[PDB]
Design a protein around this ligand. Structure first.
Ligand SMILES: C[N+](C)(C)CCO
Length: 271
């Protein structure tokens, strides 16, 4: 049984299920999803100690800072190449090419607020920060490198209130007016239909967050059919599509496994 890890995000559950279903489509391997992994670090340790055989969704900027403790790299291609090289060298892990989407932190407001105050960039809210309530996920306040501490230092603003909550809640928090601004994830499917506006990170504080599966080389050697199966997903899932899939779960109330199955059927399992 191939154990596929998912972080506590709809996106990760969808992709983990899709990869599992694709493996079962092509082979006699059983698969199962190890859900609710809390973070990049949890995924990393689980890969290294055999608790998961595949990490469905890891993100380059997160791993480059968090796991590798390297200086950030602004260019997506260079960041991916560095991550791939160092993951193989340091951990004998294969960090695959991206599925085709990046999922970045994005400061997000209602279009109404953006229109009223001409907000386009993160710097545009600097003068307003003391009068804004910011909603954020339950990790970002303690997060190192690109978390709240470095953000305040780089952008030189502090919000009037900061409210950590489970990430899935921030979208209706800002839509309903409870928060004025939230640190959303750019692939969330609610951003569009909730009429939200992502502000440009004009200081380039956030690194690239291209998403890939990661697998130990030992697992690939023992299951030589996995490489060609994983490859079928790479470069095929763009950000707009990921947003649509996430929406099916969070807005259309479908199970991630059903969303994955329906996508595979629509796209004929990528062949
Ligand atoms: C996907 N993000 C980079 C937004 C968070 C990962 O924990």
């Amino acid at each position: 049984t191939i154990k596929i890890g998912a972080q506590s995000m709809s996106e990760s559950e969808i992709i983990a299920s899709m990869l599992g279903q694709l493996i079962e489509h092509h082979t006699d391997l059983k698969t199962t999803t190890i859900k609710n992994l809390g973070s990049n670090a949890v995924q990393q340790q689980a890969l290294m100690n055999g608790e998961i055989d595949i990490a469905a969704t890891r993100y380059t900027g997160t791993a480059l800072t968090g796991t590798l403790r390297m200086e950030p790299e602004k260019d997506p291609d260079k960041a991916l190449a560095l991550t791939q090289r160092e993951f193989k060298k340091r951990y004998d892990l294969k960090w695959y090419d991206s599925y085709g989407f990046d999922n970045t932190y994005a400061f997000t407001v209602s279009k109404e607020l953006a229109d009223q105050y001409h907000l386009e960039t993160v710097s545009d809210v600097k003068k307003w920060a003391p009068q804004l309530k910011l909603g954020v996920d339950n990790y970002w306040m303690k997060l190192k490198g690109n978390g709240y501490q470095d953000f305040t230092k780089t952008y030189g603003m502090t919000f009037g209130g900061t409210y950590p909550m489970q990430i899935g809640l921030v979208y209706d928090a800002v839509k309903s007016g409870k928060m004025d601004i939230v640190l959303a994830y750019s692939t969330d499917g609610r951003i569009k239909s909730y009429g939200l506006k992502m502000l440009k990170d004009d200081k380039q504080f956030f690194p690239p967050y291209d998403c890939s599966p990661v697998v130990p080389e030992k697992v690939l050697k023992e299951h030589p059919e996995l490489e060609g199966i994983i490859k079928k997903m790479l470069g095929k899932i763009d950000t707009a599509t990921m947003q649509e899939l996430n929406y099916e779960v969070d807005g259309n109330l479908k199970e991630p496994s059903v969303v994955a199955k329906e996508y595979l059927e629509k796209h004929r399992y990528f062949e």
